[PDB]
Amino acid sequence: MGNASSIVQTINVTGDGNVFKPSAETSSTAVPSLSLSPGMLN
Amino acid sequence: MGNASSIVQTINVTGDGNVFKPSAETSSTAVPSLSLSPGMLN
Amino acid sequence: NRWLSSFVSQIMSDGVNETPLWPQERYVQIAYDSPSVVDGATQYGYVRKNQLR
Amino acid sequence: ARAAFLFKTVGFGGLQNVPINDELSSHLLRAGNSPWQLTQFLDWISLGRGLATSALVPTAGSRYYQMSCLLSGTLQIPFRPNHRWGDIRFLRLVWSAPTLDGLVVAPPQVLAQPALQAQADRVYDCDDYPFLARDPRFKHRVYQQLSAVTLLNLTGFGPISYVRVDEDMWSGDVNQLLMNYFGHTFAEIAYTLCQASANRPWEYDGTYARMTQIVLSLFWLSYVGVIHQQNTYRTFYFQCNRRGDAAEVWILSCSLNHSAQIRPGNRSLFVMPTSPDWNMDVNLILSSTLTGCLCSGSQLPLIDNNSVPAVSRNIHGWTGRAGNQLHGFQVRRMVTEFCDRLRRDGVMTQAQQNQVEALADQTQQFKRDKLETWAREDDQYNQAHPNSTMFRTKPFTNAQWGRGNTGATSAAIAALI
Amino acid sequence: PGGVPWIAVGDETSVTSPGALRRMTSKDIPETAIINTDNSSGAVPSESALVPYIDEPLVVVTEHAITNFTKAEMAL
């Protein structure tokens, strides 16, 4: 997961100042499931 | 309801005039559960 | 002259400006990730914008 | 020469909105719909010959604060990012024309629509507004009053004035112009200078700017007591027959008795009153107004961050990391400093000092009582009406009635010479 | 709707490209800051020295979330 940029880079993956701080409040979520029952969708 | 007491200011649990009459239409309910799925909540 | 007339017709044709650059009389604004270095060379007139990407 | 044009708006004094309402706004715009009311204020104070008063405007500082509040509450409409000027209303008032020429009653549709909720302690840049950017003369004319408002709103105390001593300022044209004000008073000189500045913005190092700085320096030196009839600055001084009076009058004068010795160089500093009784002192407000008019194209030095509250720090054109300190004083103690300096110089006697002290004490008592009564009345009105809360005077606290850094300020102003 | 709010960088009435938008923050909308929160529950301290003053991000609340979180208080 290396990186290299030319002239300039708005983000540096291997640079300094980044933060890795897992927390219960932040968690991590996506869209796993939705409510699509036939009767309720109509 | 409420075992024994003697105040008789606003309501009298041990007094007269109260009615205990359960029925199907009245039933009894609270807030047991809610729809808090991550996908729906977004 | 023919090439110039064609260019002016292209400019005056219909459409919109699809770039995030718009003119102002205050100063010449330079995007953050532009190859230009004129701001370093000069001392007055040019301003580089960090939020303009 | 100034390069950045920024200004700060007034902050809520404990309320949830700008301390002004429809009644006060109408009383202010009673005779003219232009929000720029410097000339109207000059007419209202009536040359400072007496104690001005009214039902809604108890003091001159009251009107000054109300002007500041009105401008702060109204200017936030065209300075929104969309930059529209006449689509929203503020207290049943709308701008007329994009060039910010006057305020009029809102149309029926805008009256039905909700008004704008203003915010506190906003800092704005004049060049952001397209019309102000386009027109330089208009911007320079407006920025004088904007600078006066900023100088009043920068801290929680009274207005700020700038004092500078420099021998190279004097020249032939300056002497010729200064000689014409031999018998006039400070109020009249301020009136004429302000009208001239309004007619034409001054340049960086013009005759009018240099003479204004000289006049301010002379007034402050005379006020402290370093310069008097027997010790003059190039045969010029200010005379006050009744020191400690409710309405003091200062007259320019010349004397050939003696001229003080001035060290070469350039020195300057920043002065302000802290006691609330500045609301009834026309001279201090006029000095602050003159400094504001100067600030249009002069780029005065920076003010140190540690002397201002947190919300006023790091303003691009006004505050900075390392800047000059603000010296605050109390009028009653400064009177005693004046008397003591004159007595040490040997031109005043103990009985005269005692008379001046008694008069000053009486004046302080009267002003304190009146200010407290007016503050209590304002509090009661705010309690009664919860939807149109207002303030008639800049809020103050009980602690501000005591002497502060008066001795240090007097010493610094004396060392200026 | 849902997601996060976006604002036009610099001038307005000029949003024709995706590069002219940036995420909105509490600095742009001051009444979403901590200091302007209505402290009817007493959670926020009343001491001025204990209240943080920093920039914060913003998110969009859906009506489903609104209804469910409103119905949550009925249990109380």
XYZ file of C-alpha atoms in Angstrom:
630
model
C 0.000 0.000 0.000
C 2.821 2.332 -0.970
C 2.395 5.731 -2.567
C 4.346 8.328 -4.578
C 3.246 11.731 -6.011
C 4.657 14.247 -8.560
C 4.787 18.076 -8.024
C 2.193 18.064 -5.163
C -0.301 15.831 -3.250
C -3.330 16.974 -1.213
C -3.127 13.717 0.775
C -0.125 11.677 1.935
C -0.806 8.056 2.868
C 2.641 7.427 4.372
C 3.116 10.985 5.626
C 2.852 12.366 9.136
C -0.090 13.877 10.982
C -2.660 11.205 10.135
C -4.840 9.808 12.917
C -5.847 6.191 13.590
C -8.182 6.164 16.609
C -10.946 3.540 16.628
C -13.767 4.373 19.021
C -17.155 3.020 20.033
C -18.931 6.280 19.191
C -17.522 6.442 15.658
C -17.945 2.726 14.838
C -18.033 1.734 11.159
C -21.112 1.245 9.018
C -22.303 0.782 5.432
C -25.679 -0.043 3.877
C -26.022 -3.749 4.779
C -29.786 -4.161 4.458
C -32.953 -2.182 3.769
C -36.672 -2.737 4.326
C -38.150 -3.798 0.978
C -41.133 -5.927 1.998
C -43.537 -6.274 -0.956
C -46.595 -5.154 0.987
C -44.876 -2.117 2.459
C -43.247 -1.049 -0.816
C -46.590 -1.478 -2.617
C -52.625 -0.829 42.750
C -49.981 0.410 45.172
C -50.517 -1.648 48.369
C -51.581 0.392 51.438
C -51.476 4.106 52.218
C -53.548 6.848 53.811
C -53.297 10.309 52.233
C -56.554 10.695 50.278
C -55.678 14.048 48.713
C -56.050 13.524 44.965
C -56.689 9.790 44.481
C -57.503 7.162 47.114
C -56.167 3.717 46.226
C -57.980 2.110 49.169
C -61.157 4.151 48.664
C -64.306 3.586 46.642
C -65.246 4.572 43.112
C -62.297 3.006 41.304
C -62.976 0.320 38.702
C -60.796 -2.649 37.713
C -62.125 -3.934 34.383
C -59.632 -5.526 31.979
C -60.710 -6.122 28.389
C -59.224 -7.059 25.033
C -59.735 -3.623 23.474
C -57.881 -1.768 26.234
C -55.044 -4.320 26.527
C -51.704 -3.136 27.935
C -48.722 -1.781 26.026
C -45.416 0.073 26.396
C -42.436 0.781 24.133
C -40.906 -2.708 23.715
C -38.806 -2.166 20.589
C -38.109 0.233 17.736
C -36.791 0.122 14.171
C -33.145 1.165 14.540
C -31.414 -0.718 11.734
C -28.247 1.042 10.504
C -29.309 0.998 6.858
C -32.656 2.647 7.547
C -31.169 5.105 10.049
C -28.413 6.250 7.660
C -7.999 36.208 -40.144
C -10.024 33.073 -40.912
C -8.577 31.266 -37.893
C -9.227 34.280 -35.664
C -12.833 34.532 -36.865
C -13.354 30.824 -36.204
C -11.953 31.211 -32.686
C -14.191 34.194 -31.921
C -17.245 32.328 -33.214
C -16.342 29.402 -30.955
C -16.052 31.791 -28.004
C -19.405 33.447 -28.747
C -21.219 30.140 -29.300
C -23.706 28.791 -26.768
C -22.802 26.904 -23.612
C -21.568 27.610 -20.096
C -18.333 27.896 -18.135
C -17.644 24.423 -16.727
C -14.465 25.395 -14.864
C -14.269 26.638 -11.252
C -12.384 29.801 -12.314
C -14.169 33.153 -12.453
C -12.650 36.611 -12.940
C -12.323 39.281 -10.268
C -10.723 42.714 -10.448
C -9.080 42.387 -7.022
C -6.249 40.046 -8.025
C -5.263 37.138 -10.236
C -6.185 33.906 -8.456
C -4.113 30.740 -8.931
C -5.420 27.264 -8.156
C -3.636 25.172 -5.544
C -2.501 22.417 -7.933
C -1.562 24.528 -10.961
C 1.954 24.272 -12.455
C 2.350 28.065 -12.435
C 5.068 29.589 -10.254
C 4.446 33.253 -11.072
C 3.263 33.940 -7.514
C 6.705 33.080 -6.167
C 8.386 35.234 -8.807
C 6.259 38.348 -8.297
C 5.410 40.271 -5.131
C 2.033 41.841 -5.976
C -1.041 40.874 -7.989
C -1.194 37.076 -7.710
C -2.865 35.137 -4.892
C -2.913 31.349 -4.569
C -6.123 29.756 -3.288
C -5.795 26.620 -1.169
C -9.452 25.587 -1.336
C -9.575 25.836 -5.140
C -8.692 22.369 -6.459
C -1.210 53.565 3.489
C -3.938 51.109 4.461
C -4.160 47.949 2.356
C -6.798 45.805 4.122
C -10.310 47.055 4.911
C -11.901 44.993 7.688
C -14.394 45.844 10.410
C -16.001 44.247 13.458
C -19.651 44.377 14.512
C -21.092 44.857 17.985
C -21.633 41.927 20.325
C -24.716 41.034 22.355
C -24.552 42.319 25.912
C -26.126 39.194 27.370
C -29.192 39.221 25.118
C -30.038 36.868 22.253
C -30.162 39.548 19.536
C -28.744 42.926 18.535
C -29.752 45.362 21.331
C -32.010 47.583 19.222
C -35.675 47.626 18.228
C -38.176 49.418 16.026
C -38.735 52.373 18.362
C -35.029 53.167 18.663
C -34.476 52.646 14.934
C -37.316 55.029 14.061
C -36.056 57.621 16.541
C -32.604 57.396 14.953
C -33.952 57.619 11.381
C -36.433 60.309 12.446
C -34.939 63.081 10.288
C -32.998 61.071 7.697
C -33.074 57.543 6.337
C -29.322 57.307 5.736
C -27.729 54.874 8.222
C -24.504 56.902 8.066
C -25.432 59.392 10.782
C -22.146 61.087 11.665
C -23.387 64.554 10.676
C -26.681 63.973 12.486
C -24.756 62.980 15.618
C -22.628 66.124 15.311
C -25.769 68.257 15.080
C -27.419 66.435 17.989
C -24.531 66.886 20.421
C -24.730 70.663 19.740
C -21.013 71.516 19.972
C -20.817 69.992 23.456
C -21.806 73.271 25.100
C -24.200 71.492 27.477
C -25.553 68.159 28.641
C -27.671 66.727 25.837
C -30.493 64.395 26.836
C -33.713 62.824 25.569
C -36.229 60.132 26.462
C -34.687 57.429 24.259
C -31.160 58.897 24.037
C -30.028 59.800 27.580
C -26.440 60.668 26.574
C -24.211 61.222 23.557
C -22.508 57.877 24.101
C -25.983 56.357 24.040
C -26.565 57.674 20.522
C -23.071 56.580 19.483
C -23.735 53.035 20.704
C -27.144 52.978 19.012
C -25.584 54.037 15.701
C -23.055 51.225 16.080
C -25.805 48.702 16.849
C -27.938 49.804 13.896
C -25.044 49.538 11.454
C -23.994 46.157 12.869
C -27.503 44.745 12.604
C -28.198 46.143 9.150
C -24.943 45.501 7.263
C -25.263 41.717 7.619
C -27.812 41.557 4.783
C -25.613 42.445 1.753
C -22.615 40.628 3.276
C -24.193 37.184 3.057
C -22.419 34.875 0.583
C -25.231 35.300 -1.956
C -24.610 39.078 -1.716
C -28.256 39.978 -2.366
C -29.153 43.417 -1.024
C -32.932 43.794 -1.072
C -34.671 40.445 -0.582
C -34.731 40.139 3.234
C -35.679 42.528 6.033
C -34.214 43.470 9.411
C -36.717 44.969 11.873
C -39.192 46.144 9.220
C -36.346 47.778 7.292
C -34.890 47.158 3.837
C -32.017 48.670 1.893
C -32.786 51.022 -0.991
C -30.486 50.574 -4.026
C -27.440 48.255 -4.115
C -25.159 51.193 -3.240
C -26.447 51.205 0.373
C -27.986 54.667 0.290
C -30.873 54.442 2.757
C -33.303 52.317 4.727
C -37.031 52.183 3.981
C -40.056 50.275 5.217
C -40.320 46.758 3.839
C -42.787 45.915 1.050
C -45.854 43.847 2.005
C -44.345 40.564 0.778
C -41.098 41.043 2.700
C -43.104 42.064 5.767
C -45.001 38.770 5.566
C -41.729 36.884 5.127
C -39.639 36.259 8.266
C -36.868 38.664 9.208
C -33.127 38.012 9.464
C -31.538 36.723 12.675
C -28.333 38.699 13.166
C -25.203 37.352 14.840
C -22.647 38.756 17.277
C -19.042 39.887 16.800
C -18.843 39.292 13.057
C -15.732 40.402 11.165
C -16.187 41.446 7.544
C -13.984 42.559 4.659
C -15.161 45.502 2.562
C -13.629 44.188 -0.669
C -15.897 41.121 -0.549
C -18.921 43.190 -1.562
C -18.819 43.659 -5.358
C -20.000 47.283 -5.434
C -17.623 48.369 -2.673
C -14.802 46.631 -4.537
C -15.772 48.352 -7.797
C -16.013 51.895 -6.428
C -12.953 53.171 -4.507
C -14.333 56.573 -3.471
C -17.514 55.034 -2.050
C -15.482 52.500 -0.065
C -13.165 55.184 1.307
C -16.101 57.372 2.336
C -17.831 54.501 4.156
C -14.692 53.131 5.796
C -14.281 56.216 7.994
C -17.487 55.516 9.901
C -16.810 51.783 9.752
C -13.435 52.415 11.413
C -15.049 54.577 14.090
C -17.536 51.782 14.813
C -14.695 49.248 14.961
C -12.693 51.446 17.345
C -15.731 51.615 19.629
C -16.585 47.892 19.408
C -13.047 46.494 19.686
C -13.166 46.183 23.495
C -15.746 46.489 26.260
C -14.483 49.882 27.469
C -14.860 53.318 25.903
C -13.529 54.356 22.504
C -9.848 54.268 21.575
C -7.694 57.229 20.529
C -4.231 57.432 18.970
C -1.538 59.857 20.159
C 1.642 60.514 18.170
C 4.558 62.917 18.652
C 6.967 63.597 15.778
C 8.833 66.820 15.052
C 9.161 66.252 11.295
C 5.392 66.600 10.831
C 5.549 70.395 11.035
C 5.900 72.294 7.759
C 4.987 75.635 6.228
C 1.516 74.639 5.056
C 0.805 72.957 8.396
C 1.820 76.115 10.261
C -0.284 78.314 7.978
C -3.364 76.125 8.399
C -2.902 75.689 12.157
C -2.559 79.418 12.787
C -6.150 79.949 11.586
C -7.659 78.091 14.582
C -6.238 80.478 17.176
C -9.428 81.124 19.121
C -11.661 78.184 18.227
C -12.560 75.266 20.464
C -11.802 71.571 20.096
C -15.401 70.790 19.139
C -15.422 73.379 16.343
C -12.063 72.189 15.013
C -13.330 68.599 15.041
C -16.509 69.645 13.222
C -14.622 71.395 10.425
C -12.048 68.608 10.090
C -14.708 65.889 9.954
C -16.710 67.759 7.320
C -13.583 68.235 5.199
C -12.672 64.552 5.515
C -16.207 63.622 4.477
C -15.967 65.859 1.414
C -12.588 64.404 0.388
C -10.759 61.322 1.703
C -7.247 62.253 2.791
C -4.086 60.708 1.384
C -1.367 58.953 3.362
C 0.790 61.902 4.451
C -1.347 64.926 3.617
C -1.497 68.309 5.299
C -4.903 67.599 6.826
C -3.770 64.248 8.242
C -0.607 65.745 9.730
C -2.535 68.641 11.269
C -5.109 66.230 12.701
C -2.356 64.202 14.363
C -0.769 67.385 15.730
C -4.105 68.592 17.125
C -4.775 65.249 18.813
C -1.305 65.238 20.375
C -1.741 68.804 21.629
C -5.144 68.047 23.143
C -3.968 64.930 24.961
C -0.790 66.584 26.252
C -2.831 69.515 27.576
C -5.378 67.128 29.106
C -2.659 65.295 31.023
C -1.044 68.579 32.033
C 2.438 68.359 30.549
C 1.737 71.374 28.310
C 0.279 74.607 29.687
C 0.625 78.377 29.355
C 4.083 78.484 30.966
C 5.276 75.378 29.075
C 4.107 75.316 25.460
C 4.688 73.042 22.475
C 5.971 75.489 19.844
C 3.826 78.196 21.488
C 0.595 76.165 21.308
C -1.590 74.707 24.046
C -5.165 74.073 25.161
C -6.797 76.061 27.968
C -9.725 74.956 30.135
C -11.132 77.520 32.558
C -13.263 75.069 34.602
C -11.518 71.728 35.026
C -13.750 69.007 36.427
C -16.967 70.584 35.148
C -19.797 68.512 33.705
C -19.229 70.003 30.231
C -15.604 71.085 29.810
C -14.620 73.493 27.032
C -11.045 73.549 25.722
C -9.705 76.472 23.681
C -6.601 76.532 21.512
C -4.156 79.251 22.532
C -0.663 80.592 21.875
C 1.878 81.931 24.362
C 5.377 83.371 24.012
C 6.396 82.756 27.636
C 8.310 79.510 27.114
C 8.731 76.631 24.663
C 9.509 73.112 25.836
C 12.397 71.032 24.496
C 11.376 68.053 22.348
C 13.604 65.047 21.776
C 13.938 64.048 18.103
C 12.178 60.925 16.914
C 8.741 59.372 16.415
C 6.652 58.045 19.304
C 3.028 56.995 19.678
C 0.544 55.069 21.805
C -3.131 54.225 22.315
C -5.409 55.680 25.007
C -8.887 54.794 26.269
C -11.168 55.570 29.217
C -12.480 52.756 31.397
C -14.936 54.434 33.767
C -18.530 54.532 32.455
C -18.766 58.328 32.793
C -17.198 58.712 29.333
C -20.765 58.755 27.985
C -20.999 62.439 28.969
C -17.627 63.634 27.607
C -17.902 64.987 24.066
C -14.161 65.609 23.707
C -13.159 61.954 24.095
C -15.766 60.743 21.596
C -14.726 63.455 19.141
C -11.070 62.436 19.485
C -12.027 58.832 18.755
C -14.049 59.967 15.734
C -11.053 61.930 14.457
C -8.864 58.838 14.815
C -11.465 56.833 12.906
C -11.545 59.397 10.103
C -7.742 59.252 10.006
C -7.805 55.446 9.785
C -9.177 55.628 6.224
C -5.781 55.813 4.533
C -3.079 55.937 7.200
C -2.625 52.346 8.438
C -2.005 53.016 12.141
C 0.197 50.565 14.068
C -1.133 47.250 15.319
C -2.752 46.608 18.702
C -1.367 43.825 20.882
C -3.553 40.725 21.131
C -3.288 40.440 24.920
C -5.114 43.759 25.453
C -8.338 42.684 23.699
C -10.822 39.854 24.301
C -10.480 36.546 22.492
C -13.056 37.365 19.805
C -11.125 40.482 18.710
C -7.747 38.773 18.218
C -5.800 38.436 14.957
C -7.824 40.933 12.927
C -5.786 41.397 9.767
C -5.617 45.188 9.858
C -6.099 45.980 13.548
C -4.720 43.366 15.935
C -1.498 41.392 15.808
C 0.852 39.094 17.664
C 3.236 41.845 18.820
C 1.650 45.284 18.996
C 1.241 48.400 21.086
C -0.429 48.243 24.486
C -3.740 49.953 25.260
C -3.604 52.373 28.191
C -6.843 52.868 30.090
C -7.633 55.603 32.584
C -10.300 57.030 34.884
C -11.437 60.640 34.504
C -11.700 61.472 38.205
C -8.183 60.242 38.968
C -6.802 61.907 35.840
C -8.139 65.215 37.175
C -6.049 64.715 40.315
C -3.018 63.814 38.195
C -3.507 67.028 36.201
C -3.721 69.131 39.365
C -0.685 67.454 40.935
C 1.438 67.920 37.816
C 0.522 71.607 37.639
C 1.266 72.082 41.346
C 4.677 70.426 41.010
C 5.347 72.649 37.997
C 4.561 75.557 40.324
C 1.627 77.286 38.607
C -1.194 76.170 40.932
C -1.966 76.444 44.642
C -3.509 74.157 47.232
C -6.796 76.069 47.487
C -7.299 75.948 43.718
C -6.564 72.221 43.740
C -9.112 71.702 46.526
C -11.791 73.612 44.612
C -11.145 71.546 41.482
C -11.293 68.334 43.528
C -14.639 69.287 45.077
C -16.163 70.134 41.699
C -14.908 66.870 40.191
C -16.345 64.846 43.080
C -19.753 66.479 42.661
C -19.755 65.806 38.913
C -18.755 62.164 39.404
C -21.517 61.610 41.962
C -24.169 63.063 39.657
C -23.071 61.080 36.599
C -22.828 57.810 38.533
C -26.346 58.164 39.923
C -27.863 58.997 36.535
C -26.118 56.111 34.774
C -27.197 53.577 37.397
C -30.812 54.756 37.217
C -30.880 54.489 33.422
C -29.345 51.004 33.519
C -31.998 49.855 35.989
C -34.771 51.265 33.788
C -33.374 49.422 30.764
C -33.243 46.188 32.763
C -36.880 46.593 33.820
C -38.011 47.251 30.244
C -36.158 44.166 29.014
C -37.799 42.111 31.760
C -41.240 43.406 30.777
C -40.908 42.856 27.020
C -39.289 39.532 26.033
C -39.568 39.933 22.237
C -38.164 43.456 21.718
C -35.268 43.582 24.170
C -32.882 46.506 23.790
C -30.152 48.531 25.457
C -29.971 52.323 25.481
C -26.324 52.515 26.608
C -23.313 50.236 26.309
C -23.466 47.803 29.257
C -20.964 48.237 32.072
C -20.107 46.504 35.336
C -19.621 47.719 38.892
C -15.880 47.007 38.833
C -15.304 49.636 36.127
C -15.980 52.444 38.636
C -12.562 52.095 40.300
C -9.188 53.486 39.297
C -7.206 51.249 36.973
C -3.924 52.034 35.220
C -4.363 55.809 35.449
C -0.915 56.401 36.928
C 0.847 54.314 34.293
C -1.139 55.979 31.502
C -0.271 59.448 32.806
C 3.401 58.497 33.080
C 3.440 57.123 29.527
C 1.769 60.210 28.064
C 4.204 62.429 29.966
C 7.147 60.400 28.656
C 5.786 60.828 25.123
C 7.151 64.386 25.098
C -32.614 13.088 2.050
C -29.280 11.930 3.445
C -25.536 12.430 3.337
C -23.665 15.628 4.172
C -24.228 19.292 3.225
C -22.060 21.041 0.645
C -21.407 24.736 0.011
C -19.993 26.694 -2.910
C -16.308 27.581 -2.688
C -15.784 31.309 -3.048
C -18.326 32.941 -5.328
C -21.934 31.768 -5.605
C -24.154 31.433 -8.699
C -21.178 29.704 -10.308
C -21.670 26.023 -9.401
C -21.138 24.192 -12.695
C -18.388 21.711 -11.750
C -17.941 19.265 -8.857
C -14.668 21.006 -8.022
C -16.537 24.124 -6.893
C -18.122 22.484 -3.826
C -16.775 21.754 -0.351
C -18.212 20.146 2.763
C -20.060 22.542 5.050
C -18.800 22.954 8.611
C -20.090 24.452 11.845
C -18.025 27.548 11.049
C -20.389 28.312 8.166
C -23.468 27.785 10.358
C -22.607 29.245 13.787
C -25.797 28.140 15.552
C -24.751 24.482 15.226
C -21.753 25.056 17.514
C -21.535 23.846 21.107
C -21.719 27.345 22.600
C -25.092 27.986 20.916
C -26.641 24.713 22.104
C -29.759 25.106 24.255
C -28.557 23.610 27.533
C -31.954 22.717 28.992
C -30.561 19.334 30.092
C -27.467 20.805 31.759
C -25.018 18.618 29.836
C -22.809 21.465 28.577
C -20.729 23.087 31.351
C -21.536 26.685 32.244
C -17.865 27.634 32.686
C -16.496 29.484 29.667
C -13.048 27.940 30.159
C -14.382 24.367 29.885
C -16.241 24.745 26.562
C -14.197 23.749 23.484
C -14.048 26.176 20.565
C -13.175 24.185 17.430
C -14.601 23.518 13.991
C -16.890 20.522 13.536
C -18.434 18.599 10.631
C -22.119 18.328 9.781
C -24.398 15.457 8.754
C -27.946 15.192 7.415
C -30.697 13.627 9.537
C -33.312 11.436 7.873
C -37.000 11.545 8.745
C -36.928 7.874 9.750
C -34.240 8.699 12.309
C -36.228 11.746 13.429
C -39.371 9.693 14.044
C -37.570 6.865 15.832
C -35.485 9.119 18.083
C -38.595 11.149 18.896
C -40.497 7.986 19.825
C -37.544 6.989 22.016
C -38.424 9.739 24.509
C -41.877 8.207 24.996
C -40.233 5.393 26.964
C -38.929 8.012 29.392
